[PDB]
Amino acid sequence: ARRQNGPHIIVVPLSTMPAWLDTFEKWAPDLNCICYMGNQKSRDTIREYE
DNA sequence: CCCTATACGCGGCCGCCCTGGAGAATCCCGGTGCCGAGGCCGCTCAATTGGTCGTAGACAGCTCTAGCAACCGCTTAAACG
């Protein structure tokens, strides 16, 4: 609505984080929501691929 | 019937076996001298006693920060089989 489609940061606890992931998958499927966990190589993969 | 050689016992001298009194070596006792140790005395200086005074530290009070017991949760690298 307000065309504020820039980078947004959401910091959540790890235990409730799939309950955020399916909410982003269902209620806002058009958004480019990405998820940030893993070891050094997975975070590097997210960093230089996405 | 008397002399003369002849075999036989043995007085005296020499050598060998058994026992006794005098002297010498040894152990014990008494008197005396020397070394280790204990007691006493003289000097003598440092510990003791008494008093005074300053202050070191105990005590109380207030403020701020580290530690501690017991729990959580995530990561991940180290320990273990």
Count every beta strand, where a strand is a DSSP E run of 2 or more residues: 0
Envelope shape: globular
Q: Compute the gyration radius: what is it?
A: 13 Å
State the helix count. 2
End-to-end Cα distance, whole Å, is 25 Å
Order of helices and strands: HH
> What share of residues are in beta strands?
under 5%
> How can the largest sheet be summarized?
none
By secondary-structure content and strand pairing, the structural class works out as mainly alpha
- Helix coverage percent of residues? 40-55%
PDB class: dna binding protein/dna
Keywords: chromatin, CHD1, remodeler, ATP-dependent chromatin remodeler, DNA binding protein, DNA BINDING PROTEIN-DNA complex
Entry title: 2.88 A S.cerevisiae Chd1[L886G/L889G/L891G]-nucleosome 2:1 complex with DNA-binding domain
Name: Chromo domain-containing protein 1
Describe this entry's structure for a reader.
The chain is mostly helical and 50 residues long. It is built from two helices and no strands. It is globular. The two termini are 25 Å apart. It binds one DNA strand of 81 nucleotides through loops.
Keywords:
1 chains; 50 residues; mainly alpha; 42% helix; DNA-binding; dna binding protein/dna; chromatin; CHD1; ATP-dependent chromatin remodeler; DNA binding protein
Summarize, please.
This protein is 42% helix and 0% strand. The chain is mainly α.
Give the helix/strand layout:
Blueprint: H1 17-27, H2 40-49
The protein binds one DNA strand of 81 nucleotides through residues 13-15, 39.
